[model samples]
Target: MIKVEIKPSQAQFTTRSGVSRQGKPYSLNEQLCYVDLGNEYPVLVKITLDEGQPAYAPGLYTVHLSSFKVGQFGSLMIDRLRLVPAK
Candidate 1:
């Protein structure tokens, strides 16, 4: 598996127009797969234990380079990542 890293969003985000959430938190898994089963990857498979859940931080992450290269393994990071997965 390639070593992909997850970075934070510096801090704060705007609210969505549809739903009403004050932006509690965001995860690497959520953005990757928005419950869109037909799209790809069974993201639930990569769900780590709640206790081990790593919060995305602000910094340099692998997604900045390329998320799909070598084997497609799960990672804990991003950078406005044009988040896409390759088969």
Candidate 2:
């Protein structure tokens, strides 16, 4: 698990089929929660779903910060991830 802070001007997640499904048309007004991998740089958090599965599906999915690229020299980080019922 990792911890820190992040500042993303724009961020989104791509599907297994190479499709940008969520957080489209990135913007500064948008906001997200994040942390540092190792004081290397800031990055946006990303979660991955199985191939051919919907990103928003209410099921099991893989979570990690290693499946994305922030910039010419940047990446993301994550401490822990799990699904919970909405209040």
Candidate 3:
């Protein structure tokens, strides 16, 4: 299991349009995914999460340079991360 942590000091964000895997309107996961609760467009938040690689194992994870080499701009701490096996 991995752990993901949020760096209270290195967090920044905005609002923008977003889509789900089904190509339909997507909503951020309040528990794991953070964004502007109310916005015309989806939240354009930064850090580990992104538009392209949206799906995660829904497990604990960690923040390592190897995990986010580039594009993962901003600051966050990976508290825990683990991959949930597929059924």
Candidate 4:
């Protein structure tokens, strides 16, 4: 019964000749979403399965991201993530 939203700050980037620089994110405003249907939710928002967060007994979740941001470049959509239940 919990929800979460994540996103970056940059939407587009300024590149050279229509090309991006190394380590430059085009969609910086993007974000990752996830949810856990467990009886006990993690205290930390950054919790992840890879980070040692135990899998939910009946994992069920829904997530939505807004935007991602970059340094001086602004915000954009970069990438997203999802954490769901396994049944």
Candidate 5:
């Protein structure tokens, strides 16, 4: 799967129109997905950015889960990640 590292927006975002996966109108911000609730387990995958890929800033960011699909694994199993600022 294509690697996806969800980074936090440093500045406060304005309420502008954005597109969702289904092409519906949406609004995005620094805080996208949060630690689901309790069980803040560390992000399962690790990343080593390629040349010129910027690191995360000292704030909130989402450690994305890659290389897997929803129904492909049978039931919808979930995981929690401990947020880490950009190194």
Candidate 6:
């Protein structure tokens, strides 16, 4: 388990996106949550779903990042990465 805060924006997951890098336009993954690591930077918060649907509405939230153990740097949520700089 892990914890942190994030800002979010959700779209109708049906929209076509990710073609430029993905090789083809595809149905956006509903769980592809765009997180505000900082408004200066926005990235997807890919979650491993345990319960409920994948699509989420845009909002600010405090979350327990389950999969990534959650460290913060380039991307917001990370692996059980308690790899902090100091003890």
Regions of model 1 farther than 4 Å from truth: 1-9, 19-55, 64-87
lDDT preference between candidates 5 and 6, better one: 6
Q: Pick the candidate with the highest TM-score.
A: 6
**Candidate 1 on 1-87: residue-level lDDT in tens?**
222323243222222233239855543323221222343532221212122233334332232253224444655443233322232
Q: Write the per-residue lDDT of candidate 2 for residues 33-84, one digit (tens) a residue.
A: 3545565664555433333433243322233454444555465533334322
Predicted candidate 5 versus true structure: per-residue lDDT over 1-87, tens digit per residue: 122234354322223356788988864332233232234542324333322334444344544454124665686543333244434
Q: Root-mean-square deviation of each candidate, in angstroms?
A: 13.5, 11.7, 13.1, 13.9, 12.8, 10.0
Error of 3 at 6 (Å): 13
Give per-model TM-scores.
0.21, 0.22, 0.25, 0.21, 0.23, 0.32
Better of 5 and 6 by TM-score: 6
lDDT of each: 0.30, 0.37, 0.39, 0.35, 0.38, 0.41
* Candidate scoring better on TM-score of 1 and 3: 3
RMSD, candidate 1, Å: 13.5
Which of the predicted structures, 2 or 5, would earn the higher lDDT when compared with the native?
Answer: 5
Candidate 4 ranges beyond 4 A from true positions:
1-48, 64-87
Error of 5 at 71 (Å): 14
Error of 1 at 29 (Å): 14
For candidate 4, report its TM-score: 0.21
The worst-scoring run of ten residues by lDDT in candidate 6 lies at 78-87
lDDT of 3 by residue, 1-87 (tens): 233433343233333557888889854322243233355643433443444444444333344444433335556544323223322
lDDT of 2: 0.37
